[PDB]
Amino acid sequence: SMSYTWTGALITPCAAEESKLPNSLLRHHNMVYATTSRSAGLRQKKVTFDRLQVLDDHYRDVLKEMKAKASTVKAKLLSVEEACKLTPPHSAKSKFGYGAKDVRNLSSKAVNHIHSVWKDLLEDTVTPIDTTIMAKNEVFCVQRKPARLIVFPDLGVRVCEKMALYDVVSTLPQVVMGSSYGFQYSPGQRVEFLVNTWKSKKNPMGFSYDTRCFDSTVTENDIRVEESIYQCCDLAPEARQAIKSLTERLYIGGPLTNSKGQNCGYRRCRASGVLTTSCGNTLTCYLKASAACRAAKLQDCTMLVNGDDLVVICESAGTQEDAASLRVFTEAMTRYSAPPGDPPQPEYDLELITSCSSNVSVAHDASGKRVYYLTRDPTTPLARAAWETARHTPVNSWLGNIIMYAPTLWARMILMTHFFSILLAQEQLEKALDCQIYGACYSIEPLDLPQIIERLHGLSAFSLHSYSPGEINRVASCLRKLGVPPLRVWRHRARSVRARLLSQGGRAATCGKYLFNWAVKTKLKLTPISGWFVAGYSGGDIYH
Ligand SMILES: Cc1ccc2oc(=O)ccc2c1
């Protein structure tokens, strides 16, 4: 059916959206923008299209295998307390007279509404449930993106989704998909898995596969198959019912309502802001892509899936032969309703593959041993840092990036330096901050960063040094592009920040010792001193 239909009501912003940047970080302010509701119409047109889906034996057989692993999962209901506790403090308020504070505080109004909504889910498995549609405000750098579309139900329901399904989405995928399930990995563990399966092959080939607006390609069938996979678990008979009702009344589609309460149309594909979105997309992508691998007769495949993001590493059959089987894989994905954005291409070098917006690169530790780490073109992370350093923002990409990308040349020399300089200057190293990891919101203390890095990465991450020239280029190149100081300058700024940090002692001294040991010249020798990378909750309204 049609992915979306539109009345003509506009997608309407709730508050004023600043499209541009209000300068110690980057001179070229004008290359940095935020998407707004102004660009909705374009995104609307890219994401709205009909879906033809043609299954086959290869799909049916994979689905049957998934279902048998799923059948060995036990999962439980969460109490309202447990589900209320998972809500982020600044989650959108309900239209029925209570917000997230009340949810978090177990106010008997919020609880009693939630009981009413849970009750309605069990009595009625048919009425589509309302959703709100919103343009996202996301920052990037020039060379332009239309705002992405978020779609989400009222708070009362979000809390019900938790009761019904939090344990399924936190436990099932890793059982069904084993090592393919990407969100069970920290960065370090992810590099290790990619690198080791690269070396496990006689003659390796790998490829990323970019699905054209994945959410829109997901059909109502896809979502019901998905439901049927959850039902394989040993579930409470009430949980079994709420899940049926949630998928029929919400996951499958429903009316779309703007900030003004006008009706915008009707969704028949994935909602990006429900609890199952991450688990759904991951299971759905793993299913089709596994099917696609069989159609293409790809030998000895390893997959790594993160929502709609896919990498495959396998045995080469030769260059002609690989390219040809890649096209088959693509025809097969396209039959299953998941056609390609960029055409997918074979790569014979692990470092040249991008997945979850990252590629492996190689460097050396203090002994001179070769160490692998994940990195990326740093344009967006710097862009959003420039923004977060400028306007005030409730979420901090920079800290997330520090954590995700601690070993990188760009995160060490630029981010840590910049933000520790700012916290230092505003006497604010102590304040916990909200950042996002695999879509869950964590409150994190910057002073704890050394411990966090040693655990997610290893002591090596404070001492890496002979970075690949390709990496080094992309970095200084990005910096020229954006108008940010060259790396020589950061080294000098870091030397100073290192020093002030040490002069404060305790944990700020530890930050000085460990984080900026790269900057010194003659190095201090460094000695040693979660429930975090377990599953994906993007769009899922989660707080740990
Ligand atoms: C390990 C790893 C790799 C890529 C990622 O991409 C993201 O957008 C968010 C988190 C993340 C984590």
Numbering used by the authors: 1 to 22, 28 to 148, 154 to 539, 548 to 562
Paste lines from the article.
To characterize the binding modes of the fragments studied, they were soaked in NS5B crystals to obtain the protein complex X-ray structures. Inspection of the crystal structures indicated that fragments 114, 204, 117, and 328 all bound at the palm I allosteric domain, while fragment 162 bound at the thumb region. Fragment 117 binds at the pocket mainly through van der Waals interactions with Met414, Cys366 and Ser368, whereas fragment 328 forms van der Waals interactions with Tyr415 and Cys366. We assume these weak interactions may result in the lower binding strengths observed for the two fragments. In this study, four fragment hits and the designed ligands all bound in the palm I pocket, where an overwhelming majority of NS5B inhibitors were also found to bind Specifically, Met414, Cys366 and Tyr448 in the palm domain of NS5B have been documented to be the “hot spots” for binding of high-potency inhibitors3854 and they were also found to be the dominant sites for fragment binding in our study.
In this study, we presented a ligand-observed MS approach for high-throughput screen of a 384-member fragment library as well as reliable estimation of binding affinity of each fragment hit. This approach was integrated into a FBLD program targeting the RNA polymerase of Hepatitis C virus (HCV), NS5B, which is a particularly attractive target for anti-HCV drug development. Similar to other nucleotide polymerases, the domain distribution of apo HCV NS5B polymerase bears an anatomical resemblance to a right hand with subdomains representing the fingers, thumb and palm. Structural and mechanistic studies of NS5B have indicated the existence of multiple allosteric binding domains including palm I, II and III pockets and thumb I and II sites targeted by reported inhibitors. The proposed discovery pipeline combining our MS-based approach and other biophysical techniques resulted in identification and validation of ten new fragments bound to two distinctive domains of NS5B, among which five were successfully translated to X-ray structures of fragment-bound complexes valuable for structure-based design of potent inhibitors.
